[PDB]
Amino acid sequence: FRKMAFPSGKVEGCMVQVTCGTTTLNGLWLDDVVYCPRHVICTSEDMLNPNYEDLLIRKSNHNFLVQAGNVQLRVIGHSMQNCVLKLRVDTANPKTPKYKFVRIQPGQTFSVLACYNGSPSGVYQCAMRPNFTIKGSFLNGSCGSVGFNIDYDCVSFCYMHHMELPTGVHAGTDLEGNFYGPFVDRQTAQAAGTDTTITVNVLAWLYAAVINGDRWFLNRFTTTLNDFNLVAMKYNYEPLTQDHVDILGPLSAQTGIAVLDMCASLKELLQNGMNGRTILGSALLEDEFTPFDVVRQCS
Amino acid sequence: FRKMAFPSGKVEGCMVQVTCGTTTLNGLWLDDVVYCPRHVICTSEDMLNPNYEDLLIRKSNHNFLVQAGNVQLRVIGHSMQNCVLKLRVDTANPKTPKYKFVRIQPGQTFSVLACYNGSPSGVYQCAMRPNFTIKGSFLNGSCGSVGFNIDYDCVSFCYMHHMELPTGVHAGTDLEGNFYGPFVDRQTAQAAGTDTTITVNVLAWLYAAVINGDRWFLNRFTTTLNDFNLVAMKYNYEPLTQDHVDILGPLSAQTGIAVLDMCASLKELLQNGMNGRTILGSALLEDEFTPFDVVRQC
Numbered sequence: 297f298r299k300m301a302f303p304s305g306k307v308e309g310c311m312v313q314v315t316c317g318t319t320t321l322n323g324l325w326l327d328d329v330v331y332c333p334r335h336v337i338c339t340s341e342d343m344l345n346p347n348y349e350d351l352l353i354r355k356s357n358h359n360f361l362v363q364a365g366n367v368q369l370r371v372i373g374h375s376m377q378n379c380v381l382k383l384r385v386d387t388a389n390p391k392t393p394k395y396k397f398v399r400i401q402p403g404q405t406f407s408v409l410a411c412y413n414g415s416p417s418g419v420y421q422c423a424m425r426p427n428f429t430i431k432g433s434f435l436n437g438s439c440g441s442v443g444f445n446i447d448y449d450c451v452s453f454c455y456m457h458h459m460e461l462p463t464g465v466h467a468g469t470d471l472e473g474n475f476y477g478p479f480v481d482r483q484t485a486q487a488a489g490t491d492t493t494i495t496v497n498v499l500a501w502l503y504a505a506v507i508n509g510d511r512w513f514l515n516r517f518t519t520t521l522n523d524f525n526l527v528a529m530k531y532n533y534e535p536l537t538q539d540h541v542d543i544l545g546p547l548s549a550q551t552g553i554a555v556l557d558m559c560a561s562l563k564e565l566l567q568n569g570m571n572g573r574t575i576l577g578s579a580l581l582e583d584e585f586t587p588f589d590v591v592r593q594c595s
Numbered sequence: 596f597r598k599m600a601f602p603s604g605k606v607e608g609c610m611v612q613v614t615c616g617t618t619t620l621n622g623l624w625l626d627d628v629v630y631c632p633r634h635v636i637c638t639s640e641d642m643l644n645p646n647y648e649d650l651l652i653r654k655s656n657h658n659f660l661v662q663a664g665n666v667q668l669r670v671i672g673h674s675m676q677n678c679v680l681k682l683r684v685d686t687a688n689p690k691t692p693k694y695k696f697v698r699i700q701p702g703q704t705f706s707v708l709a710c711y712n713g714s715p716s717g718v719y720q721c722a723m724r725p726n727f728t729i730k731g732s733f734l735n736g737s738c739g740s741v742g743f744n745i746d747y748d749c750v751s752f753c754y755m756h757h758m759e760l761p762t763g764v765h766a767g768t769d770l771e772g773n774f775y776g777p778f779v780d781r782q783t784a785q786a787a788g789t790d791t792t793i794t795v796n797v798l799a800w801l802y803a804a805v806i807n808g809d810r811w812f813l814n815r816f817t818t819t820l821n822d823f824n825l826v827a828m829k830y831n832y833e834p835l836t837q838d839h840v841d842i843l844g845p846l847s848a849q850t851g852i853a854v855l856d857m858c859a860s861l862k863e864l865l866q867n868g869m870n871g872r873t874i875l876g877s878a879l880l881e882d883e884f885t886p887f888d889v890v891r892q893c
C-alpha cells in the first residue's frame with residue numbers, strides 16, 4: 297500500500313505557459329481554450345487588493361502570450377470566470393483528452409502535476425483536507441498547476457493551484473475558478489480552519505487491513521451513524537455523510553463487514569487507543585487513502 | 596515535501612501488451628523493438644524449472660501477440676537477453692523518447708509506471724533497497740512494468756518488474772535482463788538477504804524536514820564519521836562514506852547544519868526513538884529520498 301498518482305501523460309499534453317508582462321504562470325489547454333489563474337494579469341503592487349474586473353478591462357487579447365513550449369498560440373478571446381482566466385486561442389489542442397471539470401469534496405484524493413513555465417516537473421497524490429487545504433509541494437512559478445483524476449481515459453480536472461498559506465499547506469480553485477475553502481487570490485496571509493481527520497478514509501484503511509488479514513480491531517458491537525458522528529467530533533474526526541457510507545459499500549461487501557460495525561470498531565480505537573499494537577504495520581491511522589484508492593490497490 | 600515521481604507521459608507512449616499462449620503481460624516499445632519479461636513464453640508446467648533457451652528456440656514469431664492500444668504489431672524477430680525477451684516488430688514507435696538503459700545502485704531512486712494489459716495504471720517513487728528489493732505496489736498482470744528516471748528529456752530505464760516475494764516486497768531486472776539481487780525467474784518462494792536502512796537518504800530527509808521548518812530533532816552535539824558509523828551499523832544502517840558527506844554538501848550549505856551535526860541528530864533519534872513525535876508527518880525514519888531527490892524538489 298503506497299501513495300500512487302495517476303499516469304500524467306494526458307495532462308502533460310495540455311500544459312502551456314501564460315505570460316502577462318513579466319508574470320508567467322502555467323495554463324491548461326483543452327480544445328481551443330486556455331485556463332489559468334487570473335492573477336497573471338496582476339503587477340506586484342496590484343496584488344495586495346486587486347480590482348480584477350478593472351484590471352481586465354485594460355487588457356487586450358494581444359497582451360497575452362500563450363506558449364506551448366516555445367511555440368506561441370495566438371489569443372483570440374478572453375474572459376474571467378471567478379478566479380480563472382479563460383483565453384480562447386487559435387489552435388484546438390490535438391492532445392486534448394476526454395475531460396470534465398469537477399468540484400471534489402473533502403477527503404477525496406487527486407494527482408497533482410507540478411509544473412514550472414509550462415513544463416511538468418513531478419506528479420504526486422494529494423488529499424483535500426476538511427479545511428479545504430492540500431498538503432502539496434509547490435515552489436514559485438507553480439501556480440496554474442492542475443490536480444486531476446482519471447476514470448477510463450476521461451480526465452476529471454478538480455484543482456488549479458493559487459496559494460501557499462503561512463503554515464506551508466496549499467490552496468486553490470476548481471476549474472471554474474471557485475476557491476476550495478474561504479481563501480481569496482490576494483497577496484495576503486490567510487489561515488485555514490482547524491483541520492480534522494478524514495473519517496471515511498480511515499475506515500477504508502481499516503477495510504484494507506482486514507482484506508490483508510489484519511483484523512484484531514474488529515469487535516462485536518455496532519452503532520448508529522449519528523451516535524458515531526457525535527463521538528467522532530470529540531476526537532477531531534469528520535462526521536460521516538450518507539455519501540461516505542455509500543462509497544464504503546464495495547469494501548463492506550468485499551469483507552462482509554457492515555459499515556456501521558466498522559464504525560463501532562473505529563470508535564473503540566478512538567476511545568481506547570492502539571494499546572501498543574499496529575495496523576498494516578503502523579501505529580498511526582492513515583487518512584489519505586479513499587475507498588477507491590483501497591479498491592484500486594487491491595483489485 | 597512529498598514523494599514525487601517523474602511525469603510518466605514519455606513512458607506511457609511506450610507501453611504495449613504482449614501475449615504468448617494464455618500469458619499476458621506488459622512490454623516496452625522503443626523504436627522497432629519490444630522488451631518484456633521472458634517468462635511470457637512459459638506455461639504452467641515450465642514455471643518450476645524452465646530451460647528458457649530451450650523453450651525459446653521452440654517458439655515462432657507468430658506465437659507472440661503484441662498489441663499497442665487496439666492496433667496489433669507484427670513480430671518479425673525475437674531474441675533473449677538474460678531474463679528479457681526482445682521482440683522485433685515492423686513498425687517503429689513514433690513516441691520513442693530519447694532513452695538510455697542504466698543499472699541503478701542500491702539507495703538510488705526511480706519512478707515506477709505500474710501497467711496492466713499494456714495500459715498504464717499508476718505512478719509512484721521507489722528506491723532500490725540495499726538487499727536489492729523494492730517496496731512497490733504491484734498486482735497480477737503487472738510484470739513488464741518499468742522503472743525510470745528523467746534528465747533533460749532523456750529517459751533512463753532501470754527496472755522491469757518480474758516478481759513479488761512472500762514478504763510482499765518486489766524484485767525485477769534492469770533492461771538488460773539482469774536481476775537486482777539473488778532472485779531468479781522461476782515460480783518459487785524466494786527470500787532476500789536482511790535489509791538495511793539507506794543512511795545517506797535518511798540524512799537528506801532530515802535536511803528536507805529542516806528546510807520545511809521542522810527542527811525538533813536537532814541537538815547541540817557533534818560526532819566523528821567513524822563514531823557515527825559504529826552506531827549506525829549497530830542499528831543495521833548502511834555506513835556513511837566521505838562521498839555521501841560531499842553529496843550532502845548542498846543541503847548542508849543551504850541549512851547551515853554541518854553533515855556531522857546532522858549525524859549526531861540521527862544518532863540520538865536512533866538511540867532515543869522518536870518519543871511519539873513525527874517528522875514531515877512520519878512516525879518512522881524515512882530512507883527513500885536521495886540527496887538529489889530533496890534538492891530537485893526544494
Ligand SMILES: COc1cccc2[nH]c(C(=O)N[C@@H](CC(C)C)C(=O)N[C@@H](C[C@@H]3CCNC3=O)C(=O)COP(=O)(O)O)cc12
Pocket residue numbers: 319320321335343434435436437438439440458459460461462466480481482483484485486
Ligand atoms: C499575502 O501575503 C502572504 C503572506 C503569507 C503567505 C502568503 N502566501 C501567498 C501566496 O501564495 N500568493 C500567491 C499569489 C496570490 C495573488 C494568490 C502565490 O504566490 N502563488 C504562487 C504559488 C506559491 C509560491 C510559493 N509556493 C506556492 O504555492 C504562484 O505560483 C503564483 O505566483 P508566482 O508569480 O508564480 O510566484 C501570499 C502570502
Ligand SMILES: COc1cccc2[nH]c(C(=O)N[C@@H](CC(C)C)C(=O)N[C@@H](C[C@@H]3CCNC3=O)C(=O)COP(=O)(O)O)cc12
Pocket residue numbers: 618619620634642733734735736737738739757758759760761765779780781782783784785
Ligand atoms: C511458489 O511460488 C511462489 C511462492 C511464493 C511467492 C511467489 N511469488 C511468485 C511470483 O511473483 N512469480 C512471478 C512469475 C515468476 C515466473 C517470476 C509473478 O507472478 N509475477 C507477476 C507480478 C507479481 C504477482 C503478484 N504481484 C507481483 O508483483 C506477473 O505479473 C507475471 O505473472 P502473471 O501472468 O501476471 O500472473 C511466485 C511465488
